């Protein structure tokens, strides 16, 4: 069971806007607006120069919390990237980007990561014609991510796709907005991600 609770507090504890709240991380209520300091009683106190360990810790958390994942799956994915051929740094990101929940969010089907997770969990997502209710399902390139026609008439899907009209999509993705289709064209490159995260620091958090 993933992290469930106040989220726009981690927006603060990381120091960077975390869009896990979906909307309202855009409207000036995110609490990253006019409250950029971390939570707690000592939040407005002057923070001490962090330890070298502290830096790689806050970078890993900054990424982990972004994708909304337990430490377990997070580290197993990382070690998977450490074994695979290619740059561990970008391979890991391509793997996190390949989560079905993350793709759903990325395809604009859901406002947020969490919402994408619930949408997958409840089987509203099609993959190549088949229902898939696992947020962890690894999307491959060439997979068609659709919306179950059962739910196509639901007002939350039409609500989000309504604002997806004319909105542009990631260069490794493409979607048809009327038929509620979508496709994973290829793995994203480092440059394909705007993630405010230094991968090297994370790799360097796991060398210990």
Partner 1 sequence: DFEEKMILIRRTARMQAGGRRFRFGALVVVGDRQGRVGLGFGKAPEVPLAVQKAGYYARRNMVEVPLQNGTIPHEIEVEFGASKIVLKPAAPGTGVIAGAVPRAILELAGVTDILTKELGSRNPINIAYATMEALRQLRTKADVERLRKG
Pick the closest to residue 19 from 105, 131, 126 (CA basis). 105
Binding to Mg ion by residue 172, rule CB under 5 A? yes
**Using CB atoms within 10 A of its CB, is residue 208 exposed (0-12), middle (13-18) or buried (19+)?**
exposed
Q: How far apart are CA 126 and CA 117, in angstroms?
A: 14
Q: 33-92: which residues touch partner 1 (CB under 8 A)?
A: 52, 86-91
Residues that bind RNA (CB under 7 A): 1-5, 9-10, 13, 38-42, 57, 60-61, 64, 70-72
Output the smallest distance, CB 69 to RNA, in A.
8
- What are the tokens at 89? 């740094």
Considering beta carbons, is residue 159 or 200 the nearer one to partner 1? 200
Residue 45: partners with Cβ closer than 8 Å, 6 or more residues away: none
Output the smallest distance, CB 200 to partner 1, in A.
5
Output the smallest distance, CB 71 to partner 1, in A.
20
DSSP designation for 180: T
Considering beta carbons, is residue 74 or 177 the nearer one to RNA? 74
Binding to partner 1 by residue 191, rule CB under 8 A? no
Residue 39: partners with Cβ closer than 8 Å, 6 or more residues away: 9, 12, 13
Question: For tokens 């790799």, what's the residue?
Answer: 203
Considering beta carbons, is residue 5 or 166 the nearer one to RNA? 5
Interacting residues with partner 1 (CB under 8 A): 52, 86-91, 200, 203-204, 207
């Amino acid at each position: 069971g993933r992290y469930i609770g106040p989220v726009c507090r981690l927006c603060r504890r990381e120091g960077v806007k975390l869009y896990l709240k979906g909307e309202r991380c855009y409207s000036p209520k995110c609490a990253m607006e006019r409250r950029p300091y971390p939570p707690g009683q000592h939040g407005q106190k002057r923070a001490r120069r962090p330890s070298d360990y502290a830096v790689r810790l806050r970078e890993k958390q900054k990424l982990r919390r972004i994708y909304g994942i337990s430490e377990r799956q997070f580290r197993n994915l990382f070690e998977e990237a450490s074994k695979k051929k290619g740059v561990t740094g970008s391979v890991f990101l391509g793997l996190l980007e390949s989560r079905l929940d993350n793709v759903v969010y990325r395809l604009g089907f859901a406002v947020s990561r969490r919402q994408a997770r619930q949408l997958v969990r409840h089987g509203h997502i099609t993959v190549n014609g088949r229902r898939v209710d696992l947020p962890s399902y690894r999307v491959r390139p060439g997979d068609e991510i659709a919306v179950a026609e059962k739910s196509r008439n639901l007002e939350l899907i039409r609500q989000n796709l309504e604002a997806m009209k004319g909105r542009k999509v990631g260069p490794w993705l493409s979607l048809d907005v009327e038929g509620m289709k979508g496709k994973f064209l290829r793995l994203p490159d480092r440059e394909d991600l705007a993630l405010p995260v230094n991968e090297q620091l994370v790799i360097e958090f796991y060398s210990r």
